Amino acid sequence: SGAIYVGNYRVVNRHLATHNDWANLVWEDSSRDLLVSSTTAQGCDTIARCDCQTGVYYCSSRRKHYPVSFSKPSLIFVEASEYYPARYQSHLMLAVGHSEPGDCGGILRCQHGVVGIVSTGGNGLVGFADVRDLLWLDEE
Ligand SMILES: Cc1cccc(N(CC(=O)N2CCCCC2)C(=O)N2CCC[C@H](C(N)=O)C2)c1
Numbered sequence: 001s002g003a004i005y006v007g008n009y010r011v012v013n014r015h016l017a018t019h020n021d022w023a024n025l026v027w028e029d030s031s032r033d034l035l036v037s038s039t040t041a042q043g044c045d046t047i048a049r050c051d052c053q054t055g056v057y058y059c060s061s062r063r064k065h066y067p068v069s070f071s072k073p074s075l076i077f078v079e080a081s082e083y084y085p086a087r088y089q090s091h092l093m094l095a096v097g098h099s100e101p102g103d104c105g106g107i108l109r110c111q112h113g114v115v116g117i118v119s120t121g122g123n124g125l126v127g128f129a130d131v132r133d134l135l136w137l138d139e140e
Pocket residue numbers: 015033078081083084089099100101102103104118119120121122
């Protein structure tokens with residue numbers, strides 16, 4: 001679990017969204033595994049606006065933050081799951097790292113701010129849903 005809190009927005013994995021998230025929906029995209037809802041309080045996270053390919057992510061199954069090198073956002077095949085059918089998940093970045101299906105939501109960050117959140121994993125890989133192209137998170 002985990003979310004990004006920027007301005008009056010809460011960014012979570014679409015497959016982990018609550019009823020309150022759906023009742024206060026701003027935007028969602030199943031192909032990216034992202035959902036954004038509105039908040040009453042203002043958040044403290046800042047979004048990175050860069051093309052960094054190195055950063056650090058939080059892994060809840062180890063209570064640790066790990067430095068990683070990660071690929072550029074791409075269309076990668078995600079196996080059928082209990083959340084989605086076999087499909088191409090878009091805007092996904094891969095790295096070598098530990099992940100379990102409770103690690104989703106952990107933040108990946110660089111020197112510029114938040115880059116994305118854990119969305120996929122297994123066999124010593126971890127995938128992150130990028131948010132750096134969602135310029136609207138910085139306003140309104
Ligand atoms: C973070 C992480 C670590 C390990 C595994 C996963 N799994 C696979 C998985 O949940 N399982 C159950 C256990 C072993 C078999 C497959 C994923 O990549 N998922 C699940 C959640 C939705 C993801 C998506 N964004 O499409 C795909 C995730």
